[PDB]
Design a binder for these strands. Sequence first.
RNA 1: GAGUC
Lengths: 50, 1341, 79
Amino acid sequence: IETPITANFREGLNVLQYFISTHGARKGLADTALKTANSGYLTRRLVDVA
Amino acid sequence: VYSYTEKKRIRKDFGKRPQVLDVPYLLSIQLDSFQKFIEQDPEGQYGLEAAFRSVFPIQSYSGNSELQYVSYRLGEPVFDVQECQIRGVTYSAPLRVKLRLVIYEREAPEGTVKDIKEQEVYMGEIPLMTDNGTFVINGTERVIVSQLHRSPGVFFDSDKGKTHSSGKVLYNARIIPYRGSWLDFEFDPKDNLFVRIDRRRKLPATIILRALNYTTEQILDLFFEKVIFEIRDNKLQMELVPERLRGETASFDIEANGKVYVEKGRRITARHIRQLEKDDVKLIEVPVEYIAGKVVAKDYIDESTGELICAANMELSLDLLAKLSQSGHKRIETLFTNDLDHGPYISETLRVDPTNDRLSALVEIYRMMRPGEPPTREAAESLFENLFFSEDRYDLSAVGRMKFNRSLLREEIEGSGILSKDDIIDVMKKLIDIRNGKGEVDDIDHLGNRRIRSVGEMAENQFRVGLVRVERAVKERLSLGDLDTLMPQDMINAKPISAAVKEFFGSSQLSQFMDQNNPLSEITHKRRISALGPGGLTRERAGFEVRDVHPTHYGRVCPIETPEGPNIGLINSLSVYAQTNEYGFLETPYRKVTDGVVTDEIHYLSAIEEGNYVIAQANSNLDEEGHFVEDLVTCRSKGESSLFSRDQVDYMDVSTQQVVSVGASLIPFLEHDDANRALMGANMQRQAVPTLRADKPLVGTGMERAVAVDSGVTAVAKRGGVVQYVDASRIVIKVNEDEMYPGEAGIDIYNLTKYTRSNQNTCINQMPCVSLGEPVERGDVLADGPSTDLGELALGQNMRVAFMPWNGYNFEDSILVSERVVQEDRFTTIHIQELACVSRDTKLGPEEITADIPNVGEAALSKLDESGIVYIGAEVTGGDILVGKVTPKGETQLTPEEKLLRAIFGEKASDVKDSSLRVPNGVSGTVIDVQVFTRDGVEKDKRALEIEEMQLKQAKKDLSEELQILEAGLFSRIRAVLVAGGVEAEKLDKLPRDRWLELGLTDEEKQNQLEQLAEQYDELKHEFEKKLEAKRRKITQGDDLAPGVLKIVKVYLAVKRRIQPGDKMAGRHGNKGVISKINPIEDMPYDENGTPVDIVLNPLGVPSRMNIGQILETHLGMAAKGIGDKINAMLKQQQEVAKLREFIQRAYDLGADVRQKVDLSTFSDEEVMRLAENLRKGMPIATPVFDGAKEAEIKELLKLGDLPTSGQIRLYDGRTGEQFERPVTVGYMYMLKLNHLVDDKMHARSTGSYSLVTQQPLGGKAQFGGQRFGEMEVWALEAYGAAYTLQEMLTVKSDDVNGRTKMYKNIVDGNHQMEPGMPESFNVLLKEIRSLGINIELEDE
Amino acid sequence: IETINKLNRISRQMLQEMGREPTPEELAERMLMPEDKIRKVLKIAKEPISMETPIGDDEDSHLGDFIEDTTLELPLDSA
RNA sequence: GAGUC
C-alpha cells in the first residue's frame, strides 16, 4: 500500500493508520493455523521414509 | 451537570472529541429480530404472518371444504424464568390460533351457505426471550448467534488466471436463493456457455430456452442483433450502421455515394467511421465474399415448393444466396458476430448443443438429474417447473429479489419468489457483457454481497419447515373422513411443531451456552457473528480471501476480535455503533456535511450506499461547530484514502470508537498496542474472572459504564424517586409523583439475585449500591453485578507493578507476585460447582437414598442427616461422601480364599453396592444449598418434606411481604388525595385502614381515583390468592423426570479458590503470565517511602511483543494513585471543604484540550465530601480509544501528583537494602485472573479405568485417564537409542493386560523387571483383518 | 408391539387434553391396566444407541472413547 | 468453546 504509517507506537497512530495494520496482523496469525498443518504433514512424510 | 451515580463517581474524560449521538443499547439486535417474529402487524409480512400467507388459505382436494387462518394469540408463560432454571425446563408461552373450517356445497355452485365451524386451537409452546436477551433451554442459559452468509441474488465472479496453463479468463454468475437448488453459469475454455444445475455438471445453456419453447430463431433474435442483407440484381447490399465497422480491416473497395472511401487493405480508423456516419449510410456495395462466413437469422422457407432452403443458424454459402433470391425472398436477415463487442458465443453454443425442441430439452434435463430413469412426459415437465418455478420449494425472499434486481440494474425493489423468465435471459446478457468488457465483476466478500441473519428470519425458516410436514398430514386427513360432524380440533397434531422448535433451539450449533465468565464475555459473546452454519462456509471451503480483512468491515465489524487458531477470520464481533437494516445488511451512521459545514444530522448507510460517498475521519479537526480546520482535509471514498478540499467533503465519522468492537473499546491505550497483542487482549478479557472485591478500574475508557449497564446483570432504576427499603436481597423504591401511573401503586420492587451457579462454575452475586432513603433518578445503577463497581465495569483489581528482572522468577513472562495479594484476599475467585446424585431402579431392584454404607466409619455417618443427606453449611473435602446411595448387587461368587475368610471374621455383608456420591479429590469447600427432586410416584423422604416445607415458608413470606408493602404504598397514595380537599389527620390515622372505602366525600374527580386504586386493590387480592395458590401446587406437585429415575439430588458446592502458583493472569494488552512464586512481603523491593511492590513483570516481555499501552497504563496508573493519595491525605487531615474544592476541580480541568468540562463549584458540601472519599482510593480517568491522552497531558498529571515525570523511582531491594543502580518504572495496573485454574488442570495417573475394545487407558482427567503418546512423541524415543522405554509405552503401560499387571506387582516386590508381552490392540487388529476376509497368520520360527 | 402402538397414539390425545406430559398415574387409569406394567413397558421401549455415535461435538470422540470395562480388574485389584 | 508454540 502506497500510503504509509508516519507516526509510531509511542505517539500513537490514528484511526486510519491502525486499520491498515490489521491486514498484516490478521494475515500473519491466520497463517499460523493453516500453515503449520502443511509443515506437520510434510514432516510425517519425511519421517515415514527415513 | 450530572446524575447522582455520576456525582458519586466522575471519571476524568481526556477525550478531545464529543461523541454526538449516544452509544446505542448494544444488545438490541437480538430483541429486535425476535420481536419481529411475534410482531402483530397485519400487512408486515414477517414471521407468523409471512409463513401463514405463503401456505394459506389451505383448500381441500374436492374444492368444497377449506381451512382459513384468522389470527394468533400469545399466552402468558406457563413457567417463569427462575423456575424453569430450577427444574430444567424450557421457558415458553402458549400459542393459540383462531382457525375456521368452511364447507361449500358440491351441487349448489359454490354456496358457502351450508356449514361454518370455528375455534381457537392450541399449537404448542413457543420458547420466549428473556429481559436480558437470553433463552431458557432445559435449565441452562443459551444465546443464538447472528449468522453471515452470501446473500441471495447474483454473484458475478471472475477466475483471474484461477485455472489453466494458458491463463484464460473464466466468468461465472452464481444464483443464490433463500430456499431451493443453485444455479451456475460459466465459460468453457473455448468461450462456449455452460450451466451447472444444482452444481451437478456442465451442459449447454441453450437447451434451457428450448425447454421454455423458444425456437432457435427466437433465441438468436433476442440475443444477437440482426442485419438487413438486400439482394437486388446481382449486387449484395447490407443495411450497415457505422459503429459496427468499429476497427474493421477493409476487405473491399467500399463505394458509398461518390468516390473511393476506404483503402483496399487499409483499416477503418475512427475519423473514417465518423465521416461515413456523417454521410448517413443506408445500403453499401459488398462483393461476393462478406456473407460467406456469417449466419442466417430466421427460418427462411422456400415459397415455391414449401420446403426449407435455410434453417436458423446455418453457415452462409454461395449457392444458398442464389436460391433464396430465386425464391423472391428479397429481404434476408444475416447475423452479427465480428468478435470484439458482439462475439460468436451463442452461435458456437448452438452447434455443439445436440438437442432440438422443447421435447429433447426436457429429456436431457431429466436424464442428468436421474441418469437411467425412463423419459415419461409428466416426470420431465414436473421436474423442470418444480426446480425453479415452484413457490413453496423455491423462495428468493425480499432479500434475493432486491439484490438480484440491483445486480442487473432494474428498478423494482420487491418481487415474487419464483423466477420470472425474462430475468434469466438478462443475466446471461450481463455475463456476455463482462466477457466483452461492458461491465466488470462483483466481489464475493463485499459487505453488500454478504447478508446477516438475525433471530426472526432463522425462526421464520424453521417454522416453515414444521409447517411443510404438517401440510402433508393436514391435506391427507382432509379428504378421507366425514365433512360434517368431525371438528377442527380433532384434525390438528402438535408433535412435529414442537419437534421443529426443539431442533432449532436445542440442536443448532449457532445456539450455545452463554459465556458468563464475566459481564464482558456475555455481552460480547451475544454480539458475535459467525460465518459458519447452515447455508454457510466450511473449513476446507475457506481460503485466504474470505478470512482476511475486507475493507467494508470498517465501522461495522470490529477487525480485531476473533478466536486464535482455525476459527480465526470466521467469527467476528459487531462494532459498537453498527446495526442491521431491514434487509439484514450492516449499516453505519455518519454525519452529513452540507457544503463544508458539519451538520448534526445522522444518516445510516449500508455497504452498498457507502461505496458511493466521500467521508472524513473522526480525527479531523473541527472548526467551531461549523467547518473544517484544514483547507486540504483527510478522508476516504470508494474504498481508498487520501486528500481533499473542504468543498468536496460529503460526510464524516461521529466518533473514533465506531470502528471498534465493545471488548476492544475497553482497552485504553489501544493506540500504542500492536494488533497482534491487541487481538489477544480482547480475548483475554473474555476469559477473566470476577474476584469477590470489586475495585474500580482506574485507567478506563469511560466505556465501562455503558458496558455494565447493557450487560443487564445489574439492577437499573425504572422510575427513580426515593429508596424505601434496602436489603442485601431486596431493594424497594418509592416513585416520583411526577412519573407515577394513576393505574397501579407507585412502588417498584427489585428482588436481587444472590450467589447462584454460572455455567463455567463461576459465582453470580449482586451487591446493592445505594443507601437507604437516598435519591435516585431514572436509569440509576442500583445494584451491581459481580464484576461491577458504582456504575462501572470492574473486571478485576489494580496493583502496584514494577518492571524489572528478579532472580529469574520473571523469565519468559513469568510473574512474581507478593504474599500481599493473598493477605489482602485480592483475586480470590468465587466458584460455585453443581454436583448431582441420581437414584434409579433396575432389574437388580430399587436403588435408594440411605445413610447406610458397608465398612465406613462414623466420621462419614456423623456428617450425614437422617436420609443420607449433607447438612446445610457443611465443610467438605476430597473423599467425603455427600449423598448416600445403595444399589442391589448380583451374585457374589468369591474366590475360595474369600469364602473362607468371610466365614472367619463372620461379617456376611448384604447383597448391596456402595453407589454414594463423593467429593472429587483435589476440590473442597462449602455445601451452600441442596435441592431435591422426588419422583411423582414414590413417597417423599423426611429430608424431602422439610426442604419442600422450607419452600412453602419462603414462598409465603415473600409474597406476603410483597402484598404488605404494596398495600401500604397504595393506601398512602390514597392519603394524598383525601388530604387535598379534606384536612383530617388526627382521627383518620388512629382509626382503621380499610374503612377508607366507606369514604364518600366530594363527587368530582376526587371520588373517581379512589375507586381507581380501589378496584386495583380488589385485584391485589384476587391476583395474590391466585399467585399464591399457583406456586403452592408447583412446589408440592410431584416432579416429573426421565423414565427409570426415582429421585435426584443437586448439591451446590462453594469453592473459595485462592490465587496460587500456576494460576493464569494477564492485563488488557495481551501480556500475560503464570504465577511462578509467591514472595513474602520482605523480598519485594520498596520505595524510599517504605511501600513495597505488589507484582513484578519482566521488562523483556514488552519490546518484542510490541504492546506499549501497558506502560502508559502503568504511568497514568501511578499518577491516578498520586491523585488518590493527595486526596487521601487531605481527607484524613480534614481541613476545610473549600480547600479540597480547589484541588479537585483544578485536577479535572488540567488536560490541555480536555473536552469533558467538569462543573464543580455549585456542588453542595455533602456531594463534595462524599465524592472525596471515593476518589480517596485513586482518581478514575478516561482515555477514549484513540481520542486518548497524549504523552504531554500525562506528564502534566505526574507533576500534579508530585511524582517523577518519567514515572521512575529509585528503589531499594527488600532483600539486601542495596538500591537499584537505575530508577525503575512502577505504577498501578489493572490485572485479571483467568478462568484457567491450575486447580482443575492438575492431573496424574498410575493405573485406572481402561478402554473397552483396545484395552488402553481411557482419555483425560475426566476419566482419570492416561495421556496419549502421539506419533511425534514416539519419534523422540526413536532418535535416541532407547528401546526399553519405547517398549514400556507400547506394552506394560498400555494394551498388554498380563504385562502391565505383572509388572505392577513386580515393581511392588522391588523388582523393577520388565517382562514384556503382546499388545492387545495388535490382536484387535489381526481379527479385524480376518473379518474383512483376508488371511493373515503368525509364522513360527 | 401392539401395546406400544396404544402408548404412542394415546400419548398425543392425553398431551393435548391435559395440557402437558402424561404422568404414569393418569395414563394407567386411561389405558385400563395396572400401574406396574406401565413403568415396565416404558423403559423397555428404548432402542439401542450407536457405539460410534459422535458425542464429541468435534469428531474428538466416537462414544467408544468413553467406555470403561468392569470385567477386567485393575492391577491394583490383582494385587 | 479455549491454552500452548
